[PDB]
Amino acid sequence: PTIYPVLDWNDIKFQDVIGEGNFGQVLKARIKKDGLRMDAAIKRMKEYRDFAGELEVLCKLGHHPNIINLLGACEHRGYLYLAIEYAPHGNLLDFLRKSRVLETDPAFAIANSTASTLSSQQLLHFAADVARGMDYLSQKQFIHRDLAARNILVGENYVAKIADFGLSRGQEVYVKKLPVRWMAIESLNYSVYTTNSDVWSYGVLLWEIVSLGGTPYCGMTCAELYEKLPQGYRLEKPLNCDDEVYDLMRQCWREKPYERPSFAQILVSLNRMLEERKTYVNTTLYEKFTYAGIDCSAE
């Protein structure tokens, strides 16, 4: 199990400690690649198996613009220093919340009649980016298990990249025991995960993008969700969301796993909306605009 290229320890310069989705805490650094010094992040992995397992999965990732790519690795004093892409703009949840200009800078907001520094086109492109990345991953048998805005990074040129550390690979995976608010009914009931359940999570993630980082089911407790979701209860349509975007969300939450669209179909739907001049996710103030709640007591 070897991840290339092989990086030389003395070419690595550590600059800070940061978080990067499911990679957890990583070292912001500068490495040498193809003769050039570049930004990167480094995930330190203790080799002392549980290690060999997550390394075999990481080697099956391959490359894709919408995932966090592996840049190389360096073995040093018993630990594997895995270099990965650095995301200059942090995670998507934080990015979405920092765009609520009506709260961060109301003057600019009023002056520009806007509720966000992000346009409807940009928000849908984020959704498209994740769907494109998940199509790539699921096609290769990957099962994410924790798909949500917090696990999506906004990288170079604002391209959304899926955090891909510790993923599963296969037809289905059972994980005993939690991101209850993103979990599909079958996961809540039997702790099983499939690409079909990843699609349910994607629906909630799309809901996060549309609501500009709002907390899913803000107000309801985890206990309430286990009870109501199986009865047919579903997240409500954000007030700035077009009917077509919400219906896409609803398709992702159908009770029958096999009836949910595939990530490829989701991307087709997203691209059709992006091609038209019509606004699908409103960010214009007009005469009234409401920011979705953020219950930090659930985070």
The reply to whether 21 falls in a domain is yes
Report d(CA 274, CA 297) in Å as an integer: 35
User: Is 75 found in the same domain as 20?
Assistant: yes
For residues 62 and 150, membership in a common domain is answered with no
**Of 30, 62, 86, which closes a domain?**
86
Do 104 and 223 share a domain, yes or no?
yes
User: CA nearest 143: which of 129, 161, 164?
Assistant: 164
- Whether residues 283 and 198 share a domain: the answer is yes
- Consult the annotation and say whether 294 binds a ligand: no
CATH number for the domain that contains residue 25: 3.30.200.20
Phi/psi at 64 (5° precision): -165, 140
CA distance 23 to 20: 5
Residue 62 phi/psi, 5-degree rounding, is 70, -150
Interatomic CA distance for residues 151 and 92, integer angstroms = 8
Let me know: does 257 contact 186? Beta carbons within 8 Å.
Answer: yes
Judge whether 231 is annotated as a binding position.
no
The residue from 86, 120, 138 where one domain ends is 86
48: tokens are 């002392």
The reply, when asked if residue 157 is annotated as ligand binding, is no
Q: Do 253 and 200 form a contact (C-beta atoms < 8 A)?
A: yes
| Contact predicate 106/117, CB 8 Å | no
Question: Is 135 in contact with 267 (CB distance < 8 Å)?
Answer: yes
Whether 149 is in a domain gets the answer yes
Q: Could you give the angle at the alpha carbon of 169 between the alpha carbons of 163 and 174, nearest 5°?
A: 100
In degrees rounded to 5, what are phi and psi of residue 39?
Answer: -75, 150
Determine, yes or no, domain membership for 138: yes
Task: Spell out the residues 6+ positions from residue 80 whose beta carbon is closer than 8 angstroms to its own.
Answer: 44, 45, 47, 51, 55, 73, 74
Per-residue HEC secondary structure of the chain comes to CCCCCECCHHHCEEEEEEEECECCEEEEEEEEECCEEEEEEEEEEECCCHHHHHHHHHCCCCCCCCECCEEEEEEECCEEEEEECCCCCCEHHHHHHCCCHHHHCHHHHHHCCECCCCCHHHHHHHHHHHHHHHHHHHHCCEECCCCCHHHEEECHHHCEEECCCCCEECCCEECCCCCHHHCCHHHHHHCEECHHHHHHHHHHHHHHHHCCCCCCCCCCCHHHHHHHHHHCCCCCCCCCECHHHHHHHHHHCCCCHHHCCCHHHHHHHHHHHHHCCCCCECCECCCCCCCCCCCHHHC
Domain membership of residue 286 (yes or no) is yes
Same domain membership, residue 119 and residue 165? yes
List the catalytic residues. 146
Identity at 257, one-letter amino acid code = P
How many domains, the chain? Answer: 2
Pair 180, 81 in one domain: no
Answer yes or no: do 68 and 205 share one domain. Answer: no
Domain assignment present for residue 299? The answer is: no
In this structure, the answer to whether residues 92 and 82 fall within a common structural domain is: no
Q: Which two structure tokens, joined as six digits, stand for 166?
A: 């510790």
Instruction: Please report, for the domain that includes residue 255, its CATH number.
Output: 1.10.510.10
- Name, in order, each residue with C-beta under 8 angstroms of 57's C-beta and a sequence gap of 6 or more: 142, 166, 167, 168, 169
Q: Assess whether 51 and 137 both reside in one domain.
A: no
Domain hosting 56: range is 1-86
Tokens 């599909």, residue located = 184
Does 31 share its domain with 53?
Answer: yes
- CA pair distance 114, 61, nearest whole angstrom: 39
Is 67 known as a binding-site position?
no
Experimental method: X-ray
Resolution value (Å, 1 decimal): 2.2
CA angle 152, 157, 161 (to 5 degrees): 20
Task: Flag whether 43 is marked binding.
Answer: yes
237-260 burial code (b ≥16 CB/10 A, e <16): bbebbbeebbebbebbbbeebeeb
Q: Give the integer Cα–Cα distance in Å for 178 and 164.
A: 18
- Cβ atoms of 289 and 100 within 8 Å: the answer is no
53 is known to lie in a ligand binding site: no
Would you say residue 120 lies in a domain? yes
* 116 and 260 within one domain: yes
Contact 21, 83 (CB under 8 A): no
Phi, psi (deg, nearest 5) at residue 131? -65, -35
| Residue 295 counted as domain residue | no
| Residue 297 placed within a domain | no
Give the max Cα distance, the chain. Answer: 62
Which two tokens mark 1? Answer: 């199990």
CA distance 90 to 153: 6
Q: Are 205 and 152 in contact (CB under 8 A)?
A: yes
Assess whether 179 and 63 both reside in one domain.
Answer: no
Please check whether residue 102 is in contact with residue 289, taking contact to mean a CB–CB distance below 8 angstroms: yes
Residue finishing a domain among 63, 86, 109: 86
The Cβ of residue 176 has, within 10 Å, a number of other Cβ atoms equal to 4
